[model samples]
Target: NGIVPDAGHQGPDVSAVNGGTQVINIVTPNNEGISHNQYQDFNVGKPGAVFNNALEAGQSQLAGHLNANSNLNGQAASLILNEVVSRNPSFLLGQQEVFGIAAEYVLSNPNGITCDGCGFINTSRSSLVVGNPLFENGQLKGYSTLNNTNLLSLGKNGLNTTGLLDLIAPRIDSRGKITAAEISAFTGQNTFSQHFDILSSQKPVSALDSYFFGSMQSGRIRIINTAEGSGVKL
Candidate 1:
């Protein structure tokens, strides 16, 4: 939530315009108030066992704000997740308010909705999420701030953060089409310490040295999967 993009590098200054601003919204579809204690570390028979309340009151206060924004009826926010998930928006950032609440809401309502983490997964159910894998060598290394190093990837391997956010972004190819496999081949065994672009995660703003930094926004590929489907970009 506190990630502010580094704007010192030379580029088109997209952030100046968009400023990486994101809208925050929450939805609660249930009857009984959610028990926030599950996410906290506590054991029964402990000194604080009698605690029968939601986590911090801050969450409850936020819920009130969300309800006010959506104008949802009190009963609607009680304990029926299906009522909310059936017609909720497809995407939302900051998996805290609605997302976290929705996951807990599943305990009482399986048919309410599923809580599977989205992003890249293999042909098998095994997630493509990996370890502190290198990206662009070392110039850009993404580690899991949340999920204990559980990285979220969208490409063949799970190292490209460029593709993670922008589906048609950081265009490396001038034509604007590339595959994850192509990305993999290009960035096979390079490191940021070497050239900074050997196998870039996303295309850089400048194309002066594509070998080290290809345009992630542009390219063409058909090996692993379509860039559109994976939501990758240069």
Candidate 2:
């Protein structure tokens, strides 16, 4: 539930004790701090930094993704959430990509259907930053953002170091480089490719997987809330 040692440091520890190659996988999600501009919940701390950190230098060389690409599109999130609810996987990790705007989109974009029966989750914890106030009738309605849904609450130790690599590893080439074939493999599933690009650096070659997404992000992946829960633990 708290910060553990980094994989690089922890790996050797586990290996030395086990007396062999130890494959240790840590599944922590939504560990990214909440945004500093948050309202209501006052998450004014993280998700934004965690999301931006995905764009780390040399890391971009691992993948070419830009927010303008809607790399974290809402529709794909709907599908992923659907899977989380249906199949009920364990240990869900948010990967710091979910922003307050993403949460709001899920709530407000009920009519904006990208796929049938997609939107479901209805809870928002966005930030409150008012620059230009607009009125509806005689009352101020709401302010405007760059349409940047910068509301995902991120935190330290919440970073999914292995999350992006797990998503992109499947598409990499033998030489540890992303190729056109990998991109083409994600023809309809653009979110899969784009979101993976956000953390494409940590991806591993010739391995099954290093990370897995849970159902939700609280601190650790809890599975007690089955029925509609993501059955994963950190």
Candidate 3:
């Protein structure tokens, strides 16, 4: 229930307005018996490189905060991953906005900062829900974070940069296990279309970058297997 931007609209491009500020309004979920809009302000720095650093810095800090005291020891792995990764549409939209703008800006600046590394970011999902304490007791008790290591690796690889997929692969799964197979399968999809742009500089490219944003278009994709009752395997 965080700030719900208009359909097809994410947020402002921080790089577009230097010395200005962009506000991201987040609406609190009703699950916590509280419903209100919380706004996050980001300073719009000049130049694409500066903006890129500011964006990544802010997002990384939020990610660390969210995962700092999380119950990743098994008690809150699947629950946290499921809710954090897909339950909150508004929060995911905010992330998409950041990546979208960052990608566009860096691509435009051929000699800008190289955003070729992996990192994480916080989301709207919190432990204050019905069963989680991350967001319980009135304040934001728990925080949800998303890892973009896989996405970042994909970007770097597309640009033929000096990067390693193993460096960020084998990410922690919903069950709290870092299985190699899943990560490899997710990143090794050759059938998928991949595009690379802005290769003149050391900045990261944008192609497989859309994988994460595209997934966030909807909170979750509902799979209805109509063949469940039929004998046909097709």
Candidate 4:
């Protein structure tokens, strides 16, 4: 044909193939801000393929970006998680599943590591050094009251003053108490539970018991890429 452009000053050169099957080749520029100035030619072969490719790319980019940002100049994980959620639902779903499982575990085992009648529950409390005078006295009283206030303050915003309570009320009681059965029922209603659930009734409830309060070693989360033709063959 004529002169087929390879790339541009900013954007990539996207060429479409019409024979056999429709394929879109998105060629990233040789030197650009995208993906560490590295060139990437992604051949998308079907409708909705772009979404899958974008999802993987975000995952790869985020993993590398996050590791590098620990020592260099780059985007933060919070922003990356946000962008990844918007572009990569699958990845976001995986993250939510992990968190949901842990949350369910905590709900199942509120008695912490001491094993109930054996010792005390491992509790973490934050002091309000900026305003509270109680810190100076070295006296912290009413764990339940402090804990309830702390829980209520989480995810608080201008909208609906008791948003967190409203969200968790139906799952728990008016006293902010939650049971394993209630947690299981509550999490089962969410979309993330479709992919993964900690409380299957069939599955061992003790799995969560040990995980929430037991001692553990180093752990790493690995996200499997299920999308085909999303990356260059290596």
CA-lDDT, candidates in order: 0.20, 0.19, 0.19, 0.15
Q: Candidate 4's C-alpha lDDT?
A: 0.15
TM-score of the candidate numbered 4? Answer: 0.14
Which regions in candidate 2 have their CA more than 4 angstroms from the true location?
A: 1-64, 67-85, 99-102, 105-234
Candidate 3 clash figure, as a count: 10
Which has the greatest TM-score? Answer: 3
lDDT of 3: 0.19
* Candidate 4: pairs in clash: none
Off by over 4 Å in 4: 1-8, 19-234
What lDDT would candidate 1 get against the real structure? 0.20
Tens digits of per-residue lDDT for model 1, 1-234:
211212222111111112323222223322333211111110111010111112222222112311122423332222211111122112212121221122211111111111112221111111121112223432324211111211122222122222212121111122222223223322111222211222323322233111112333325432121122232234
* lDDT, candidate 2, 1-234, per-residue tens: 111122332111111112111111111112122111111111111111112222122222112232321332222122111001111111212212332223311111111101111111122321112111223553323332222211111122222221211111111111122111111111000111212222112212222211222222233221111112112123
Candidate 3, residues 1-234, lDDT tens digits: the string is 222222322221222222222223222223422222221222112121121212112332222211111111211111111122122211111121221111211111101111222222221221111111123444434321111223211222111111111111111111111112112112211111111111111111322221221111122222211111211111
**Model 3 spans with C-alpha error above 4 angstroms:** 1-4, 7-22, 32-118, 122-153, 157-234
Best by lDDT: 1
TM-scores for every predicted model = 0.17, 0.16, 0.20, 0.14
